[PDB]
CSV table of all heavy atoms in Angstrom, one decimal:
chain,number,residue,atom,x,y,z
N,1,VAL,N,56.6,140.4,105.3
N,1,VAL,CA,56.8,140.9,104.0
N,1,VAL,C,55.7,140.3,103.0
N,1,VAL,O,55.1,141.0,102.2
N,1,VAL,CB,58.2,140.7,103.4
N,1,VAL,CG1,58.3,141.1,102.0
N,1,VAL,CG2,59.2,141.5,104.2
N,2,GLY,N,55.5,139.0,103.2
N,2,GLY,CA,54.5,138.3,102.5
N,2,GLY,C,55.2,137.6,101.3
N,2,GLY,O,54.6,137.1,100.4
N,3,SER,N,56.6,137.5,101.4
N,3,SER,CA,57.4,136.7,100.5
N,3,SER,C,58.1,135.8,101.4
N,3,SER,O,59.1,136.2,102.1
N,3,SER,CB,58.4,137.5,99.6
N,3,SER,OG,57.6,138.4,98.8
N,4,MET,N,57.8,134.5,101.3
N,4,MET,CA,58.5,133.5,102.1
N,4,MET,C,60.1,133.8,102.1
N,4,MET,O,60.7,133.8,103.2
N,4,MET,CB,58.2,132.1,101.7
N,4,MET,CG,58.8,131.2,102.7
N,4,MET,SD,58.8,129.6,102.1
N,4,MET,CE,58.8,128.6,103.6
N,5,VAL,N,60.6,133.9,100.9
N,5,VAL,CA,62.1,134.1,100.8
N,5,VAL,C,62.6,135.3,101.4
N,5,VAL,O,63.6,135.3,102.1
N,5,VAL,CB,62.5,134.1,99.3
N,5,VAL,CG1,64.0,134.3,99.2
N,5,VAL,CG2,62.2,132.7,98.6
N,6,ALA,N,61.9,136.4,101.3
N,6,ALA,CA,62.3,137.7,102.0
N,6,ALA,C,62.2,137.4,103.5
N,6,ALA,O,63.1,137.8,104.3
N,6,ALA,CB,61.4,138.9,101.6
N,7,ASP,N,61.0,136.9,104.0
N,7,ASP,CA,60.8,136.8,105.4
N,7,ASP,C,61.8,135.7,106.0
N,7,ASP,O,62.4,135.9,107.1
N,7,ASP,CB,59.4,136.4,105.8
N,7,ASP,CG,58.4,137.4,105.5
N,7,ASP,OD1,58.5,138.5,106.1
N,7,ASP,OD2,57.4,137.2,104.7
N,8,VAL,N,62.1,134.6,105.3
N,8,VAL,CA,63.0,133.6,105.8
N,8,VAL,C,64.4,134.1,105.9
N,8,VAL,O,65.1,134.0,106.9
N,8,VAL,CB,63.0,132.3,105.0
N,8,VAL,CG1,64.2,131.5,105.4
N,8,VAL,CG2,61.6,131.6,105.3
N,9,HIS,N,64.9,134.8,104.8
N,9,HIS,CA,66.2,135.4,104.9
N,9,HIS,C,66.4,136.4,106.0
N,9,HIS,O,67.4,136.4,106.7
N,9,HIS,CB,66.4,136.0,103.5
N,9,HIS,CG,67.8,136.5,103.4
N,9,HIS,ND1,68.9,135.7,103.2
N,9,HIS,CD2,68.3,137.8,103.5
N,9,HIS,CE1,70.0,136.4,103.1
N,9,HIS,NE2,69.7,137.7,103.3
N,10,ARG,N,65.4,137.3,106.3
N,10,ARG,CA,65.6,138.2,107.4
N,10,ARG,C,65.7,137.3,108.7
N,10,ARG,O,66.5,137.6,109.6
N,10,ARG,CB,64.4,139.2,107.5
N,10,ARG,CG,64.4,140.1,108.8
N,10,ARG,CD,63.1,140.3,109.4
N,10,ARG,NE,62.1,140.5,108.3
N,10,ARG,CZ,61.0,139.8,108.1
N,10,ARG,NH1,60.7,138.8,108.9
N,10,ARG,NH2,60.3,140.1,107.1
N,11,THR,N,64.8,136.3,108.8
N,11,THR,CA,64.9,135.4,109.9
N,11,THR,C,66.3,134.9,110.1
N,11,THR,O,66.9,134.9,111.2
N,11,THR,CB,64.0,134.3,109.8
N,11,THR,OG1,62.7,134.8,109.6
N,11,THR,CG2,64.0,133.4,111.0
N,12,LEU,N,66.9,134.3,109.0
N,12,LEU,CA,68.2,133.7,109.0
N,12,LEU,C,69.2,134.7,109.4
N,12,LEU,O,70.1,134.5,110.2
N,12,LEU,CB,68.6,133.2,107.6
N,12,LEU,CG,70.0,132.7,107.5
N,12,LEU,CD1,70.2,131.5,108.3
N,12,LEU,CD2,70.3,132.5,106.0
N,13,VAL,N,69.1,135.9,108.8
N,13,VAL,CA,70.2,136.9,109.0
N,13,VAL,C,70.1,137.7,110.3
N,13,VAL,O,71.1,138.0,110.8
N,13,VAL,CB,70.3,137.7,107.7
N,13,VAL,CG1,70.7,139.1,108.1
N,13,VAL,CG2,71.2,137.1,106.8
N,14,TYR,N,68.9,137.9,110.8
N,14,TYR,CA,68.6,138.7,112.0
N,14,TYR,C,68.0,137.9,113.2
N,14,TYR,O,68.0,138.5,114.3
N,14,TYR,CB,67.8,139.9,111.7
N,14,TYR,CG,67.7,140.9,112.7
N,14,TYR,CD1,68.9,141.6,113.2
N,14,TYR,CD2,66.5,141.3,113.3
N,14,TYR,CE1,68.8,142.6,114.2
N,14,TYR,CE2,66.4,142.3,114.3
N,14,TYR,CZ,67.5,142.9,114.7
N,14,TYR,OH,67.4,143.9,115.7
N,15,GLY,N,67.6,136.7,112.9
N,15,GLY,CA,67.0,135.9,113.9
N,15,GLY,C,65.5,136.2,114.2
N,15,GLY,O,65.0,137.1,113.6
N,16,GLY,N,64.8,135.4,115.0
N,16,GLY,CA,63.4,135.6,115.3
N,16,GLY,C,62.7,134.4,114.8
N,16,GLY,O,63.4,133.3,114.8
N,17,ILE,N,61.4,134.5,114.4
N,17,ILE,CA,60.6,133.4,114.1
N,17,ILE,C,59.7,133.7,112.9
N,17,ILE,O,59.1,134.9,112.8
N,17,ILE,CB,59.8,132.9,115.3
N,17,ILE,CG1,59.3,131.4,115.2
N,17,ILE,CG2,58.6,133.8,115.6
N,17,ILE,CD1,58.5,130.9,116.4
N,18,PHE,N,59.4,132.7,112.0
N,18,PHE,CA,58.6,132.8,110.8
N,18,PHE,C,57.5,131.7,110.9
N,18,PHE,O,57.8,130.6,111.0
N,18,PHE,CB,59.4,132.8,109.5
N,18,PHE,CG,58.5,132.8,108.3
N,18,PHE,CD1,57.8,134.0,107.9
N,18,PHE,CD2,58.2,131.7,107.5
N,18,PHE,CE1,56.9,134.1,106.9
N,18,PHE,CE2,57.4,131.7,106.5
N,18,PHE,CZ,56.7,132.9,106.1
N,19,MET,N,56.3,132.1,110.7
N,19,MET,CA,55.2,131.1,110.9
N,19,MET,C,54.2,131.2,109.7
N,19,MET,O,53.8,132.2,109.2
N,19,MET,CB,54.5,131.4,112.2
N,19,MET,CG,55.3,131.1,113.4
N,19,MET,SD,54.6,131.9,114.8
N,19,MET,CE,54.6,133.6,114.4
N,20,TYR,N,53.8,130.0,109.3
N,20,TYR,CA,52.7,129.8,108.4
N,20,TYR,C,52.0,128.5,108.8
N,20,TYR,O,52.3,127.5,108.3
N,20,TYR,CB,53.0,129.8,106.9
N,20,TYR,CG,51.8,130.4,106.1
N,20,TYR,CD1,51.9,131.5,105.4
N,20,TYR,CD2,50.6,129.7,106.2
N,20,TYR,CE1,50.8,132.0,104.7
N,20,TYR,CE2,49.5,130.2,105.5
N,20,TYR,CZ,49.6,131.4,104.8
N,20,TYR,OH,48.5,131.9,104.1
N,21,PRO,N,51.2,128.6,109.9
N,21,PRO,CA,50.6,127.5,110.5
N,21,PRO,C,49.2,127.3,109.8
N,21,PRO,O,48.8,128.1,109.0
N,21,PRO,CB,50.2,128.0,111.9
N,21,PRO,CG,50.0,129.5,111.7
N,21,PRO,CD,51.0,129.9,110.7
N,22,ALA,N,48.6,126.1,110.1
N,22,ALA,CA,47.3,125.8,109.4
N,22,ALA,C,46.2,126.8,109.8
N,22,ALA,O,46.1,127.3,110.9
N,22,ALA,CB,46.9,124.4,109.6
N,23,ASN,N,45.4,127.2,108.8
N,23,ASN,CA,44.1,127.9,109.0
N,23,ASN,C,42.9,127.3,108.3
N,23,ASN,O,43.1,126.5,107.3
N,23,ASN,CB,44.3,129.4,108.7
N,23,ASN,CG,44.3,129.8,107.2
N,23,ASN,OD1,43.3,129.7,106.6
N,23,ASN,ND2,45.5,130.1,106.7
N,24,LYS,N,41.7,127.6,108.7
N,24,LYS,CA,40.5,127.2,107.9
N,24,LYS,C,40.6,127.3,106.4
N,24,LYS,O,40.2,126.4,105.7
N,24,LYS,CB,39.2,127.9,108.5
N,24,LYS,CG,38.8,127.6,109.9
N,24,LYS,CD,37.3,127.5,110.1
N,24,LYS,CE,36.7,128.0,111.4
N,24,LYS,NZ,36.7,129.5,111.5
């Protein structure tokens, strides 16, 4: 979605994985 809170909540509620790893 590009909103941490939207993406994390879907994660919490439906499961799966959310990532924002390091980039250049």
Side-chain angles (χ1 to χ4, degrees):
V1 174
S3 295
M4 191 194 202
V5 176
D7 291 297
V8 165
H9 187 78
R10 178 216 318 121
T11 303
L12 173 66
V13 148
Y14 192 61
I17 204 183
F18 177 72
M19 288 163 303
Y20 208 119
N23 77 71
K24 296 215 214 78

